Design an enzyme around this catalytic site. Structure first.
Site, short mmCIF file in Angstrom:
data_model
loop_
_atom_site.label_atom_id
_atom_site.label_comp_id
_atom_site.label_asym_id
_atom_site.label_seq_id
_atom_site.Cartn_x
_atom_site.Cartn_y
_atom_site.Cartn_z
CB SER C 713 32.40 -53.99 81.13
OG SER C 713 32.62 -52.67 80.67
CG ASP C 791 28.18 -48.65 86.18
OD1 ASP C 791 29.01 -47.88 85.71
OD2 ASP C 791 28.19 -49.87 85.96
CG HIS C 823 31.86 -50.22 85.04
ND1 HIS C 823 30.61 -50.41 84.52
CD2 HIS C 823 32.72 -50.74 84.14
CE1 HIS C 823 30.70 -51.00 83.35
NE2 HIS C 823 31.98 -51.21 83.09
#
Ligand code: GK2
Ligand code: GK2
Lengths: 846, 134, 846, 138
Positions: C713, C791, C823
């Site tokens: 991330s 994602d 994700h």
């Protein structure tokens, strides 16, 4: 296995490898000039002027990077002992025919992807001889010009006249009406349009499309060849002008027909593929018919209209067959090709069945097409009106146990000698196994059909009996028919000029034969090279763009010359040269062609790039480059430097590069190509391994412990087949764009070769590389997967599903994405990255 | 030329288009010392020479890299057939190796395009032709 | 450099590395337990029985592999000196509450991805205490049950009653009506529905969604919180029941209000992201508001209905505000939170502006909502009908120069005394810089509004003056308000129980204070651990699920006990234990927490995992794990083994693992978090570099020549920031799921921290790593990009655009795809592969 | 057209055929400083007249310096040096001898020299094997 006698490749830094790849292409701009092609010979008919002809062609002069319309002046007599190479005069006034930074519309980019058009600008043009009309697509608009029709032959260039439009969207597929040069036609937003150069007046002809939303909601198109036809059956148009004009005799009105293919691709699966503009993060819908799934529902249709003598489209009319196409012609999955006979009497079409083992030519006389209306009583009314004699004549019917290759050669002759008995020149590979020309005389005797009621066809319903089918060529060699090859038929001398592999499969030569007496075939091109040829319409001289393994391609103009009484033996004498052999890249060592025999005793050919500055004793590591799949032939006597410069770069770093044409390749006949049927992936890799083992025994510099397999499209699929079934042979496998799952690939290719999955489930599973990931190496650095992210051909799904199953089987992989590249790496930056990644991967891990 | 009659200085009609003219009164000639070009003939006649530039002409022909320019590209307008030898200043390579004399090919341009006639014989700094020098 | 005083990690084969990673998670069946949660205390009051309460909760004893409803029996008195550990009995009859192979429906899988629910079964339920009704979502259906209302406290498990439906589609977001337990409500196809448990009769309430096509053509939803609200403002519902029932007094009909949010996401960009079923090759449209682009156009609305005493939904009515929402509340971009006061008088809502530096609480009285009609005369008619005094009261208005964090703490009291004021509790970080509770008394004095004619508000239009704003807490520490923390307000004792960081930022402790007289803050939890707590509604006992850096997580039940006259000092005594701190393995060596000061003098905390079996002298290679972005805190005193087992695996192979909480992290106040404002990437990496350097001096086992930066991330974005601006520090950079382009990220997160591309273009460009690819290493094996292909949070576009710019700048990269992962890597096979890939990459190239 | 002479190098091998080429320099007498322009060009009078009329327009004049004593390879990279190289600002490191048409400006090495000097060393040198081909003392 002495480790001091095993060649170590010099470990270059990444910037070093970039310096080497860039250093390859310092001299490669001059090697490829996108040499003259798309030739149109025109006479001058002066008898006092200097030039005998004018050659029109596409080409890239030194000032521009772009492909444009040009001409050369072919003289009335050259001087002896002097090589005359023609200057490329410009037709157009040096304008920009390409949008900014090489961008295009979506239809243009898709069409250039199907045609493999790597070059920018004027790629396809249309020409009409007598009026001398040049209709082309430049920028995102249509243009035209003319050169010596009712006008004259220019010497300075004239700027191209722009054809404006009221239509919103790009104008695909322009074609000049042969019968009336003032009229032309194009596709606009999946509908056939028609226009007039003199008046500027446009006019839509079909109304199946509406421009509402994506293709999931407005699914009927007209005059367009869909994906699977474009990609597999190599047709990039779905409308065909009639070459002659009929006159209805109401008042004065001149009718002008067009045959077009309506396709209702509603019942066909939609797939989303990422758009080129990555920032927008949107997709494009694609009507991609999977194997097993439904193809578009096709039909042939007549779009007529009539014109005043001033040249205005007064009336218009859609027409359709008296019964549906699917009902008149059941089991007809694909319209491979279509067109018209020259007089205009019949519209021909090559049909094909869903297995693609059943091709048949049919003639559709225009009276067979009644108009169309929603009221079924008007339909019955003109069903009564259609002549009972008129019907479709199935002239030729190829049936095979392997598969039909679409051969576009069909040359029907004039029929005014006793006006039945159609005579044509049909290429037929299914008969003997090799694509050979035939003269076929069928017998069109009408059976008499009540066309108002619906009947069902039988299996031999409209099939005409054949009078005769003389074979004008025969042997263990083939006539080039696919890949836009063609025959040129002089009907005055009764000769047919074709290209073929008669001397050798490694060399495309121009041959001539008579269609009256099938005598000795005569070669016109020089041996020891391979030739791409194009005849004059008056057949007195041709061009040949030719090359050899060592020499680059040159473009020479030869002239058939000799006694007129014996036209077959007219000796082609070199007249003039268009393009000359550009001096090689530095450090470019041409590959050596070889052949060998398989344990089953079939002759396979191969190439090898030797490691530069070879020291005998040293066992060098070997990159087996491969494609292996059908419709391609890597190994032939022709210049590889253009498309395979990377293979020479590998060689210049010290890699042995081996290339083998396994069984299943093109231009070695049907039985040869047929080996891979329903067991695709299983025989080709065995032939490549055997080719390696032969070259290893023959030449003493291949380290078998260090073997890389590499290729794109079908090549990556085989590279993965190599790493699965031969890990002990192949040390690494750089798989570019691989087909990992056949069940995901389209009908046109796969069903031809692998059948419907419901039938050949054993071979679909056996040759889908994604399904056998457990057999890939558990160790790393043995598998590099390359894929262009926008590939709408071998969809990213294939690489994605492979990576999925590698993850699920717990196997490593390296991976490289080309986010802006579809199927062939087109961007030079991306190609330089691709090659430096290839050199690095081999440097480190082979 | 600076032949038997001494310096017959070339008159210049226009510096910008590089055109020259001479009238040379006696037989033969001697090389003009700017580069060494020399044409020899029997009799007193007028002639003009243009020093044409390759750049428009080798834009027409595409492997312009495949031919290396050796000299000035001079055009001659005399009367045809009265010139008997023209000498063009070949850059020297016979002092070195790997350059062949059967190899050499002469650029005779026309509106038709490039004619690669064979030169008759090569000197140390010169190529000689026969009578039909157009 | 010393030639052999640098620790070399043992080069394991890939299968060896798999054996190690698999060997890591063999005890994850016990220590990754999904510790029990969502506790609901319910009294029994039998006056003869053994157990004082029943604790209802979610839990997973691993008798089945799914999370299900359970209960515990809280006794009246335990025995001293005995660790009482409660058996986890099942409420439900052992059914599987999850489908086969962990699959889900369309939007419930996305809701789980927003809530980060990695566990299966029943992950959320709703409880109505008086009835005892439990309403939960199972695999494909709604269920309920009850416990001791008019019926009885169960002892054996009871099967769950099924609620059938006429609706086609899943029933999202179930909530029981507090005022009438027979009624409940849910979302069906982006519309609010309402039902009744006894009769089974359902009834739609909104009609803004019609299901025509995909979301690109049917854009209005109701009662749903959209992506950016779900993802950034941590709200997963957009409808709120009224807790009380009004009685109109027509005949007997009981009105029941619901506040809901209409959102018109038509003018918001649609993006296509690949669907989970890769074979089907289609995407899903997502109404993804880019940074800069427009958010959905929101509005609040009242959906009422009335009911007969037998319980049938007789009438229904959509209601809307007397002026538009956009006009009554200009500059209101997002509804952070909303609900109702407990008595039912006003519906509150947190509004927010596009910079997200302006938050304001508003009360919306239901008479402010007229019905809705197309007739503008009916609209004016009920605009006259609305009382001139009634209007909305802006009670609180937080303004800040940094950014508003949405704190969901707003506790309003009863307004029975005086009725012309409002007293509430409110978390407010903007005043001092740290999130602190306040008691705020505002004054609701009506200005008198003509609601038929329109007007524009001023900047202080509906803003009420505050009577007082007493601060119940203050200091250099904060009250936990985000991340689903909450306060528990005993109104009898006048105490408010909250969680905070008062002892230390590394430990969440339960504190109590009086809201009347803010004297002293009493801690209730044991120090040296971090606690997640939850109170009884009777405020006599709580649960705490707590842990420490060394000890695994335990779940203990404590009891507030002491003199009733002084409730603040009631002493928490350990009553019983539910789940205990498991066997911390000898394979698992806990990390050591440290702190240090920056050259600017701010204290940063960090962890380190030492290399197992350390030999002092040897300089080991170091993996700097990182996140660094806001709303996260890696370093704290709490068990890392569950989510960060890979960090210990790295340590067990010999990697130093350093983890640093740079400036800009959560739970250290606003000035700390605001360090990286309008400049993301520029300050965080500087703090990580300084921390790594600090760690090296503090500890003698870090080889600075071998440093890897790894993150996911925001962590991958920083890994790329590390490799761009500090290549001499960071040898490699394993960037997982990185944000390579801020301009592509959503409004809610990026605009809060980075203002907009138009205003802060220097800082968008400066901190977008894909625009700084030229500064990445020219050498290979230094950058591995990981990305989950589906994602929907940080889209694949980011990795794609990075790879694009790497290709264009001529830079190498390695890359790994997770085709079935979004994700985070949810799947264990994919996580095993991912970890192995990480070990191999570090093994070979660090 | 026009007559002329060109040589075709054999296709297979890049021979790097030597040329009679002459390098020349141009002075400034009038302005406040002196700039040399080294034209490493083929020895053709048309190229000579092109650099002539360009430098006449630019108010440069050539001085007759000795040419190379031996023919030198076309296309090879040639470093340019001298006694004043590094204290006086030579513009390129490497120069190119390859032919260009007289119409366009020829590739050159600029050399700001400052004072004109009594006599100055110049150097050009083959990058293949570092053998001397040329020297001139002003
Ligand atoms: B690839 O080989 O280019 C791909 C996989 C199978 C066939 N194919 C194609 O792109 C085409 N359909 C054929 C015509 C090569
Ligand atoms: B990642 O850090 O998880 C991603 C990139 C920036 C913010 N973000 C998110 O997933 C969320 N929107 C926030 C709330 C963490």
């Amino acid at each position: 296995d002495d480790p001091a006698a095993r060649f170590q490749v010099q470990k270059h830094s990444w910037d070093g490898l970039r310096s080497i790849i860039h250093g390859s292409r310092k001299y490669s701009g001059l090697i490829v000039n996108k040499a003259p092609h798309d030739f149109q010979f025109v006479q001058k008919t002066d008898e006092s002027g200097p030039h005998s002809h004018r050659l029109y062609y596409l080409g890239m002069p030194y000032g521009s990077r772009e492909n444009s319309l040009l001409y050369s002046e072919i003289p009335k007599k050259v001087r002896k002992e002097a090589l005359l190479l023609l200057s490329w005069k410009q037709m157009l006034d040096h304008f920009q025919a390409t949008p900014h930074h090489g961008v295009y519309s979506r239809e243009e980019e898709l069409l250039r992807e199907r045609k493999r058009l790597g070059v920018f600008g004027i790629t396809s043009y249309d020409f009409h001889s007598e009026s001398g009309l040049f209709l082309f697509q430049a920028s995102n608009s249509l243009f035209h010009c003319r050169d010596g029709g009712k006008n004259g032959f220019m010497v300075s260039p004239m700027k191209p006249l722009e054809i404006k439009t009221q239509c919103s969207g790009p104008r695909m597929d322009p074609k000049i009406c042969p019968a009336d040069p003032a009229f032309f036609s194009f596709i606009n937003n999946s509908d056939l349009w028609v226009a007039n150069i003199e008046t500027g007046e446009e006019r839509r002809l079909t109304f199946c499309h509406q421009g509402l939303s994506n293709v999931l909601d407005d699914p009927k198109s007209a005059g367009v060849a869909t994906f699977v036809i474009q990609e597999e059956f190599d047709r990039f148009t779905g409308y065909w002008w009639c070459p002659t004009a009929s006159w209805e005799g109401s008042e004065g009105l001149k009718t002008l027909r067009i045959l077009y293919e309506e396709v209702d691709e509603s019942e066909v699966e939609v797939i989303h593929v990422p758009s080129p503009a990555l920032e927008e993060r949107k997709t494009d819908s694609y009507r991609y018919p999977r194997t097993g799934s439904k193809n578009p529902k096709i039909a042939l249709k007549l779009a007529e209209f009539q014109t005043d003598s001033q040249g205005k489209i007064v009336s218009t009319q859609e027409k359709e067959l008296v019964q549906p196409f699917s009902s008149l012609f059941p089991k007809v999955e694909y319209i491979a090709r279509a067109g018209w006979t020259r007089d205009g009497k019949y519209a021909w079409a090559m049909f094909l069945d869903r297995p693609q083992q059943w091709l048949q030519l049919v003639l559709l006389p225009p009276a067979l097409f009644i108009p169309s209306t929603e009221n079924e009583e008007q339909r019955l009314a003109s069903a009564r009106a259609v002549p009972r004699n008129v019907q479709p004549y199935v002239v030729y019917e190829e049936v095979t146990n392997v598969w039909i290759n679409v051969h576009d050669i069909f040359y029907p002759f004039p029929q005014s000698e006793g006006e039945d008995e159609l005579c044509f020149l049909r290429a037929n590979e299914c008969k003997t196994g090799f694509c050979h020309l035939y003269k076929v005389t069928a017998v069109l005797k009408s059976q008499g059909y009540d066309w108002s009621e619906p009947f069902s066809p039988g299996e031999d319903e409209f099939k005409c009996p054949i009078k005769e089918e003389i074979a004008l060529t025969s042997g263990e060699w083939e006539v080039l028919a696919r890949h836009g090859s063609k025959i040129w038929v002089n009907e005055e001398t009764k000769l047919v000029y074709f290209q073929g592999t008669k001397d050798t499969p490694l060399e495309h030569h121009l041959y001539v034969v008579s269609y009256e007496a099938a005598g000795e075939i005569v070669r016109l091109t020089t041996p020891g090279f391979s030739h791409s040829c194009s005849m004059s319409q008056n057949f007195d001289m041709f061009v040949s763009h030719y090359s050899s393994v060592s020499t680059p391609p040159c473009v020479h103009v030869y002239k058939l010359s000799g006694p007129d009484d014996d036209p077959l033996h007219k000796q082609p004498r070199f007249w003039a040269s268009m393009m000359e052999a550009a001096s090689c890249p530095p450090d470019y060592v041409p590959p050596e062609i070889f052949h060998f025999h398989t344990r089953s005793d079939v002759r396979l050919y191969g190439m090898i790039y030797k490691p530069h500055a070879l020291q005998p004793g040293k066992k060098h590591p070997t990159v087996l480059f491969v494609y292996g799949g059908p419709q391609v032939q890597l190994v032939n006597n022709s210049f590889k430097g253009i498309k395979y410069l990377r293979l020479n770069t590998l060689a210049s770093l010290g890699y042995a590069v081996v290339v083998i044409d396994g069984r299943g390749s093109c231009q070695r006949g049907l039985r040869f190509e047929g080996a891979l049927k329903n067991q695709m992936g299983q025989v080709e890799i065995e032939d490549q391994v055997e080719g390696l083992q032969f070259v290893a025994e023959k030449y003493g510099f291949i380290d078998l412990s260090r073997v890389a397999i590499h290729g794109w499209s079908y090549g990556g699929f085989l590279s993965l087949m190599g790493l699965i079934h031969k890990p002990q042979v192949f040390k690494v496998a750089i798989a570019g764009a691989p087909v990992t799952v056949w069940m995901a690939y389209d009908t046109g290719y796969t069903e031809r070769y692998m059948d419907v999955p419901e039938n050949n489930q054993h071979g679909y599973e056996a040759g889908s590389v994604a399904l056998h990931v457990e057999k890939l190496p558990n160790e790393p650095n043995r598998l590099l997967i390359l894929h262009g992210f926008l590939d709408e051909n071998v969809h990213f799904f294939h690489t994605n599903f492979l990576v999925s199953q590698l993850i699920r089987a717990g196997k490593p992989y390296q991976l490289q994405i080309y986010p802006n590249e579809r199927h062939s790496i087109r961007c030079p930056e991306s190609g330089e990255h691709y090659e430096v990644t290839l050199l690095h991967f081999l440097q480190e891990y082979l | 030329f600076w032949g038997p009659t001494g310096p017959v200085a070339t008159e210049v009609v226009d510096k910008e288009k590089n055109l020259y003219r001479v009238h040379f009164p006696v037989a033969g000639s001697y090389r003009w010392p700017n580069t060494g070009l020399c044409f020899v003939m029997r009799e007193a006649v007028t002639v003009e020479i243009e020093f044409c530039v390759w750049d428009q002409f080798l834009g027409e022909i595409n492997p312009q890299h495949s031919w290396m320019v050796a000299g000035p590209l001079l055009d001659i307008k005399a009367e045809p057939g009265a010139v008997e030898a023209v000498h063009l200043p070949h850059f020297v390579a016979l002092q070195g190796g790997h350059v062949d004399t059967s190899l050499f090919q002469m650029a005779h341009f026309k509106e038709e395009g490039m004619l690669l006639e064979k030169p008759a014989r090569v000197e140390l700094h010169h190529i000689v032709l026969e009578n039909p020098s157009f």
